[PDB]
Amino acid sequence: FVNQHLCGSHLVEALYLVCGERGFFYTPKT
Amino acid sequence: FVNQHLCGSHLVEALYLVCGERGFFYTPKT
Amino acid sequence: FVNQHLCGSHLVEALYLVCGERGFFYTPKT
Amino acid sequence: FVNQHLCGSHLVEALYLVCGERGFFYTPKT
Amino acid sequence: FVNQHLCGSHLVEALYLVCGERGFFYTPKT
Amino acid sequence: FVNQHLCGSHLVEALYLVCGERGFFYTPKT
Amino acid sequence: GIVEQCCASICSLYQLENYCN
Amino acid sequence: GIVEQCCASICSLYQLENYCN
Amino acid sequence: GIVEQCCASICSLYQLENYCN
Amino acid sequence: GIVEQCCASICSLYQLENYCN
Amino acid sequence: GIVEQCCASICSLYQLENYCN
Amino acid sequence: GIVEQCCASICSLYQLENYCN
Numbered sequence: 001f002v003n004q005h006l007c008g009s010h011l012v013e014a015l016y017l018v019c020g021e022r023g024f025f026y027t028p029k030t
Numbered sequence: 031f032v033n034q035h036l037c038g039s040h041l042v043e044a045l046y047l048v049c050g051e052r053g054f055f056y057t058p059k060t
Numbered sequence: 061f062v063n064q065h066l067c068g069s070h071l072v073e074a075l076y077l078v079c080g081e082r083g084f085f086y087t088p089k090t
Numbered sequence: 091f092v093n094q095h096l097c098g099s100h101l102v103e104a105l106y107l108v109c110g111e112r113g114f115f116y117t118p119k120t
Numbered sequence: 121f122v123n124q125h126l127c128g129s130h131l132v133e134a135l136y137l138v139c140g141e142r143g144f145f146y147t148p149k150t
Numbered sequence: 151f152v153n154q155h156l157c158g159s160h161l162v163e164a165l166y167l168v169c170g171e172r173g174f175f176y177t178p179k180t
Numbered sequence: 181g182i183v184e185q186c187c188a189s190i191c192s193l194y195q196l197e198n199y200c201n
Numbered sequence: 202g203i204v205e206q207c208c209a210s211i212c213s214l215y216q217l218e219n220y221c222n
Numbered sequence: 223g224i225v226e227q228c229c230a231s232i233c234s235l236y237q238l239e240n241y242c243n
Numbered sequence: 244g245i246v247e248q249c250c251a252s253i254c255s256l257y258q259l260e261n262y263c264n
Numbered sequence: 265g266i267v268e269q270c271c272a273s274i275c276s277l278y279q280l281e282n283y284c285n
Numbered sequence: 286g287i288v289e290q291c292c293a294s295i296c297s298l299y300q301l302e303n304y305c306n
């Protein structure tokens with residue numbers, strides 16, 4: 001897989017495809 | 031058919047802008 | 061809504077969804 | 091049906107690259 | 121019909137994340 | 151056409167639309 | 181869920197905000 | 202407009218440039 | 223314009239809606 | 244190619260990696 | 265979280281899969 | 286290559302078309 005920083009919507013889209021029908025959680029607040 | 035996989039990427043992109051720091055969960059399972 | 065800088069195509073897509081069937085104008089030259 | 095809402099995001103993304111600094115108007119109303 | 125042009129942008133976006141530095145070729149011709 | 155730096159997936163998508171049914175090659179390793 | 185209510189018909193920002201945290 | 206000419210069939214860059222300013 | 227208001231600095235939804243038509 | 248195997252049905256990351264270099 | 269691990273720094277696929285559910 | 290020519294620096298449409306096949 002790609003080996004670089006993935007930010008904002010590019011992180012959500014990387015999550016979307018990696019996880020498949022499992023889905024995911026996006027929690028940016030820290 | 032139509033395409034809910036292509037729609038799902040648009041959906042999670044839309045949710046990244048709408049939810050902001052509240053974050054979200056994407057579960058196509060119910 | 062998201063509270064961050066939105067640039068290039070991420071601004072056009074934020075516009076696309078915010079405005080709905082009203083449409084919008086994208087005028088980057090200043 | 092098919093999906094002109096999902097097509098519209100692609101359309102305004104395409105227009106951001108093609109028009110550049112000339113900018114554009116997206117009106118799905120005519 | 122369905123839309124393989126809109127699917128193709130998603131496809132080449134997916135391949136950018138999966139292939140990383142190996143790169144790819146997109147040929148809808150075979 | 152747009153006159154700015156196009157990086158990562160924004161370069162792949164610019165390629166996707168510019169080239170049309172010809173397709174393209176994305177080779178980021180140098 | 182969201183796939184059956186928002187891919188079968190258009191969902192505004194307001195309808196999408198229902199699925200946030 | 203653009204939605205009926207370019208979502209029903211593929212529009213090249215050249216066809217898309219017609220809708221710029 | 224929009225680049226200056228929303229990219230250089232940040233825009234609330236109300237402000238981004240100034241660029242709707 | 245990829246358009247007929249992955250637009251007609253969903254392709255996982257693993258199926259997509261087959262079309263890399 | 266994810267922003268700190270995957271945007272500030274880089275994430276392998278295994279690590280990005282920690283945020284799958 | 287393309288990253289160096291089009292991301293580090295800017296590419297005209299003619300130049301970006303060098304990476305079409």
Ligand SMILES: [Zn+2]
Pocket residue numbers: 010070160
């Ligand atoms: Zn981006």
Ligand SMILES: [Zn+2]
Pocket residue numbers: 036037040096097100126127130
């Ligand atoms: Zn799409």
